[PDB]
Each structure stands twice: as C-alpha cells, then as structure tokens.
Design a protein around this ligand. Structure first.
Ligand SMILES: [Fe+3]
Ligand SMILES: [Fe+3]
Ligand SMILES: [Fe+3]
Lengths: 56, 47
C-alpha cells in the first residue's frame, strides 16, 4: 500500500534519530570520562612533585 | 508508546546538555592543572 510505506519511512527516520542522539550522548559520555582521567592523573603528578619538594 | 519514546527522547536531550556542561567544566580544570604542573616541572628543570 501507500499508507504502510509512509508509516515505515516515518519509523525508519524516527529510529535513526534516536540512535544519533543516543550516540552523541554516549560519545560525549566517553569524552567526559577521559577528561576525568586526565584530571586525576595530572593531580597525582602534581602532588608527587609537591611532595618531592617538601621532602627536602 | 509515542509518549514513552518522547520521554526517552526528552531525557537524552537533557543528558546531552548536562554532559556538555560537565565536559566544559572538565576542560577548564584540566587546563588549570596543566598550567600548575607545567610550573612545577619548570622548577625541577633547573639543575
Ligand atoms: Fe608519577
Ligand atoms: Fe528530564
Ligand atoms: Fe613558569
């Protein structure tokens, strides 16, 4: 029919849209975790050097 | 069913906005910690 197609195309479009949004969200979520790592790591490095200095 | 998907959609948009906020926060902190660390290293790089 011609009404079933219009319904399908709709869904296929509507589906690809959620996927893009979920995907955007997930990638943004992975980028954020990476940043939290750099942050912690840098902080550990900083504390290490500070300690080195205080130890003198 | 349409509504469920609509809420599912509203929630993900809300989430992207939060992460985009936190992401911006983290960049500044990382940039901040990088400068601090850079100075500490420059201290030891004397000898
Ligand atoms: Fe270390
Ligand atoms: Fe919400
Ligand atoms: Fe300096």
């Amino acid at each position: 029919e011609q009404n079933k197609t219009a319904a399908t195309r709709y869904r296929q479009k509507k589906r690809a849209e959620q996927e893009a949004l979920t995907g955007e969200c997930k990638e943004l979520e992975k980028k954020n975790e990476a940043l939290k790592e750099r942050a912690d790591s840098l902080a550990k490095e900083i504390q290490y050097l500070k300690d080195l200095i205080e130890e003198v | 069913s349409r509504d469920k998907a609509k809420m599912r959609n509203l929630e993900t948009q809300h989430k992207v906005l939060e992460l985009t906020a936190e992401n911006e926060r983290l960049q500044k902190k990382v940039e901040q910690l990088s400068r601090e660390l850079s100075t500490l290293r420059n201290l030891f790089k004397q000898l």
